[PDB]
Amino acid sequence: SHTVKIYDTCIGCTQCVRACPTDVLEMVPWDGCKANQIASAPRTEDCVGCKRCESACPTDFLSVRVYLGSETTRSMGLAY
Amino acid sequence: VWAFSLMFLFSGRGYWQELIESIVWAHNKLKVAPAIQPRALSITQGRAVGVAHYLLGGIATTWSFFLARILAVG
Amino acid sequence: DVAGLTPCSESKAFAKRKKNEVKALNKRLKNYEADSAPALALKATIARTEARFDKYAKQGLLCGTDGLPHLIADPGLALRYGHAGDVFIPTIGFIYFAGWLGYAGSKYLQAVAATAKPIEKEIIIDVPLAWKLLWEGFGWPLRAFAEYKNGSLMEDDAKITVSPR
Amino acid sequence: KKVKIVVDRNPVATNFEKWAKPGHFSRTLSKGPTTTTWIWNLHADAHDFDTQTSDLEEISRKVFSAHFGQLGIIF
Amino acid sequence: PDVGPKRGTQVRILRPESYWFRETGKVVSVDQSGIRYPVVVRFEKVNYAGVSTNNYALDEVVAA
Amino acid sequence: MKDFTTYLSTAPVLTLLSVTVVAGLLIEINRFFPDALIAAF
Amino acid sequence: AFTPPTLQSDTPSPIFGGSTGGLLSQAQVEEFHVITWESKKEQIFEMPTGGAAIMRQGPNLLKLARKEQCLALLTQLRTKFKIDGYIYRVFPNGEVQYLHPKDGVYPEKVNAGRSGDNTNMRRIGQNKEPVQIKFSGKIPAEF
Ligand code: CLA
Ligand code: CLA
Ligand SMILES: CCCCCCCCCCCCCCCC(=O)OC[C@H](COP(=O)(O)OC[C@@H](O)CO)OC(=O)CCCCCCCCCCCCCCC
Ligand SMILES: CC1=C(/C=C/C(C)=C/C=CC(\C)=C/C=C/C=C(C)/C=C/C=C(C)/C=C/C2=C(C)CCCC2(C)C)C(C)(C)CCC1
Ligand SMILES: CC1=C(C/C=C(\C)CCC[C@H](C)CCC[C@H](C)CCCC(C)C)C(=O)c2ccccc2C1=O
Ligand code: SF4
Ligand code: SF4
C-alpha cells in the first residue's frame, strides 16, 4: 500500500517497469514524449517499497516516485 | 581509532552527501571546486571503513596493553 | 610578568625541573662505560636537554606556578611585553604558508579546469604545471588582494547552484 | 590425459603504458574518474580477477604471478 | 522555422529542481514535434545518478 | 620513459613522494634546529 | 479482446526433492500463488526457495507463497530459458485470480488499452504544501 506516482517528465524508457520485481509499473500509450509511451502504476497494491523502480529512472529529477505508507502483509513482504 | 570507527558505523551516506554539498558550495563560491566530484563513500565502503577502523583500534589497544604489561612485569 | 607569570629565567620551579630531568638522565648514565655507544647517546641526550633549558630561559618565556613555559595569544598584550614570538609571529608564518599552499592548489584547479579532460588532470597531475604554480604561489597575499580588489576572486551566487530551499 | 607442462610464449608485453593509465583492467572503471567513487573502486577491484576477465586461464595465470609477488614480499 | 535554442550553443539551466540549476550546458538537439521538454542539454559534470544529459523545456533554458 | 614518467605523475605516487619530501624536510629542520617553541628571530 | 487462461489444476509439477522453504501456515489462511509454464526439454532450474528442481517436458505447475517469488522464478525462466509462464493467485476458498501477464502482453511493452492509474500530470515539486493540506488524511502527492 505504498503510493507510487509517475510524473510527466517521464520519457518512456521502460527501465522502471523492467526493474520492478512485483509487477506494479506498466507501459501505457502516451503522447507527451518521443517514445509515445508513459509508465503507470495500476497494481500499486503489490508495491513492496524496494525503490528499484526509482533507482533506474534516468530523468532528473526522478519521474517514478514512491511514497512508503501503510503496511500490510503484501507490503511488508511476509512469507511466514 | 576505535572511537573514530563509530563515525562510520552509526552514520549513513545521505547526511554526508548533503554536508559535502554545502562544502562544495563553499568551494564553488571561490572558484576552487574540483573537476572530480567529491562523493560521499558508498554504503558498502562506509561499512568497510567502519569495520576496518573498529578492528584496528581494538587490536592495537589490546596489543599495546599486553606488551606494556608483559614488558614491565614478568 | 604579564599575568602573574614570572620569567622562567627567574622561576625556581623551572630550574628545579631542569635539575630533576638532568639528574634522571645522569642516573641512567651510571650503568655504562662512558665511551660506549649507549653512553655517548646518553651524553648527547643530556647535552640536548641542557641546551633546551638554557635556550628557553634566554628567550624569556613565562613560567607559571609550575615550571612550564606559557604563551600569550593577544596582540598588544604581547607586543608591549616582548612576547610576540609566542603566537602572533607564528600566526603570520602559518597564515602565509597555508595561504601559499591553498593558492597554489586553487590556481592549479583553475588552470586545469579549462582543458580537454579536467577530470583526468586531477588523478594524473601535470608536474611541471603544478611546480610552476607552486612557485607562483609565494606572492599569494599580493595576488589574492589584487583579485579581491578586482572582484575576480569570488563568484556571484546567481551562478552557484543551490538546493531547493 | 597425461599430466604435462604447457606454456604460452610471451603472452604479455612488458611495457609501462598501462601504469600511466589507472583502471585499465576493468571496463567500467575505464573512461576517466567522473567522481571520487572511481578512485575508491579502482582499489576495491584491483585483485578481483574474476571481474577483469571471464577466462579461467587468465584468472589462473594472474593468481600464479600474484603468489610469486607475495612470496617475494615475504622474502 | 526552427524553435528554441540553436544546436551547439551554451545555455543556463533554470529548473530549480535540477542538479544543474544555474549551470551551463550545450544543446545537442531540440525536438520540433511538440514535446513538453524537447531541449536536450549535455553537461560535462555528472549528477548523483551518473548521467550528464537532460531534457528541458524552452522557458527554463536561457541561452548564453 | 614517457609512460614511466606519466606513472610517476600519478596521484598515488606523486602524493606519497611529496609527503616523503615534506616529512624529510621537517625531520631535517628539527634535526638541525630542535626544540624550537617560539619564533625567536 | 483478451481472455486470461484457465488454471488447470491437474498439471505435472517439477521433480523436486522437498524443501524447508516451501509453503507455511500463511498459505492456508490468506492466499498463495501458482506459476505454470511449458518446457521444451526436461532441464534443471533453481527454485527460489533454495535447492534445484527439474522441470519436465510440457506443462509444469509450481505453487509458492509470495507473488514476488513467482515473478523471480519467471524472470529466471525468461532470461536463461526463454520460457513464458502464467501466474495465478489462489485463495483458500477456491477463488482464483490471474496475475502477471495481465493483458497477455508483458509489462514493458505498450498494449494500447491499459489503464493509466496513478499518473499525475505535474512535476515533482508541483505538489501541494503540507501546511495547506494539514489535518487531511492524505499526503501531498495524492492531491
Ligand atoms: C588546494 C585545494 C583546496 C583549497 C584551496 C581549499 C579551500 C577551502 N576549503 Mg577545502 N578541501 C580540500 C582542498 C582544498 N580546499 C580537499 C582535498 C578536501 C578533502 C579532504 C577538502 C575538504 C574540505 C572541507 C570538509 C572543508 C573545506 C573547507 C575549505 C574552505 C575553508 C578553508 C580551510 O581551512 O579548509 C580546510 C582544508 C582542509 C580540511 C584540507 C586541505 C587539503 C590539503 C591540505 C590541500 C590540498 C592541496 C592539493 C592536494 C595540492 C595541489 C597543489 C598543486 C601544485 C597540484 C576553503 C575555501 C571548509 C569549508 O567548508 O569552508 C568554509 C570545510 O569544511 N575543505
Ligand atoms: C602482497 C601485496 C600485493 C601484491 C603481490 C600485488 C600484486 C599485483 N597487483 Mg596490487 N595492490 C596491493 C598489493 C599487492 N598487489 C595493495 C595493498 C593495493 C592497495 C590499493 C594494490 C593496488 C593495485 C592496483 C590498483 C593494481 C594492482 C595491480 C597488481 C598486479 C600488477 C603488479 C605489477 O605488475 O606491478 C609490478 C611490480 C613491481 C615491478 C615491483 C615493484 C612494485 C612497484 C612498481 C613499486 C613502484 C614504486 C616506486 C618505488 C615509486 C614509489 C616510491 C616513492 C613514492 C617514495 C599484481 C599481480 C594492477 C593490476 O594488474 O590489477 C589486476 C593494478 O592496477 N594492485
Ligand atoms: C587490524 C586490521 C584491520 C583490517 C580489518 C579488515 C576489515 C575490512 C574488510 C573489508 C573487505 C575489504 C576488501 C574488499 C573491498 C570492499 O569490498 O569494500 C567495499 C568498498 C567499495 O566497494 P563497493 O561496494 O563500492 O564496490 C562497487 C565497485 O566494485 C563497483 O565499481 O571498498 C572499500 O572499502 C574501499 C577500499 C579502499 C582501500 C584502499 C585505500 C588505500 C589502502 C591501501 C592498502 C593498505 C595497505 C594494506 C596492508 C599492507
Ligand atoms: C590577530 C590575531 C588574532 C585574531 C583576531 C581576530 C578577531 C581575527 C578575525 C577575523 C575576521 C572577523 C575575519 C573575517 C573574515 C572574512 C572573510 C571573508 C575571509 C576570508 C578568506 C578567503 C576568502 C580566502 C580566500 C583564499 C585565499 C586568499 C588563499 C587560498 C585560496 C582561498 C580562495 C581559500 C588572535 C587574537 C586570535 C590571535 C593572534 C593573532
Ligand atoms: C565521515 C563519513 C563519510 C565522509 C567520508 C569521506 C568524505 C572520506 C574522507 C576521506 C578524505 C577525503 C581523505 C582523508 C585522508 C586521511 C588522512 C587518510 C585516508 C586513508 C586512505 C589510505 C584511504 C561518508 O561518506 C560516510 C558514508 C557512509 C557512512 C558513513 C560515512 C561517514 O561517516
Ligand atoms: S524509468 Fe522514469 S522516465 Fe523511464 S519510463 Fe519509468 S518513469 Fe518514465
Ligand atoms: S517500489 Fe519496488 S515494488 Fe514498488 S513500484 Fe517501485 S519497483 Fe515496484
Side-chain angles (χ1 to χ4, degrees), chain C residues 38-49:
Chain C
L40 269 67
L42 268 297
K43 291 205 144 69
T45 299
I46 304 193
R48 270 193 306 259
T49 296

Side-chain angles (χ1 to χ4, degrees), chain C residues 14-31:
Chain C
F14 179 68
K16 175 213 162 56
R17 208 175 271 271
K18 172 177 182 176
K19 155 173 288 183
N20 278 263
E21 272 177 52
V22 173
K23 306 299 139 199
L25 282 150
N26 296 347
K27 187 81 214 90
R28 276 228 291 159
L29 264 171
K30 311 206 216 284
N31 291 69

Side-chain angles (χ1 to χ4, degrees), chain D residues 65-75:
Chain D
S65 292
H67 291 176
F68 271 122
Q70 170 68 218
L71 277 188
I73 296 288
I74 289 186
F75 272 118

Side-chain angles (χ1 to χ4, degrees), chain B residues 30 32, chain C residues 73-75 87-88 91 98-99 102-103 106 140 144 153:
Chain B
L30 294 173
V32 187
Chain C
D74 173 36
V87 171
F88 187 33
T91 298
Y103 199 71
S106 168
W140 85 261
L153 189 70

Side-chain angles (χ1 to χ4, degrees), chain C residues 82-148:
Chain C
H83 287 122
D86 303 358
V87 171
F88 187 33
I89 298 312
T91 298
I92 297 319
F94 175 78
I95 288 307
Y96 184 89
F97 281 105
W100 160 70
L101 185 46
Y103 199 71
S106 168
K107 298 319 290 174
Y108 176 91
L109 276 183
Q110 298 158 29
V112 309
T115 43
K117 277 263 293 194
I119 62 170
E120 171 46 1
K121 296 325 290 170
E122 310 205 39
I123 55 155
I124 309 282
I125 305 99
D126 192 55
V127 176
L129 184 54
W131 192 68
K132 170 201 296 181
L133 288 152
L134 197 69
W135 263 105
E136 316 180 343
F138 279 129
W140 85 261
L142 285 73
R143 285 160 60 81
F145 205 85
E147 297 187 19
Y148 162 65

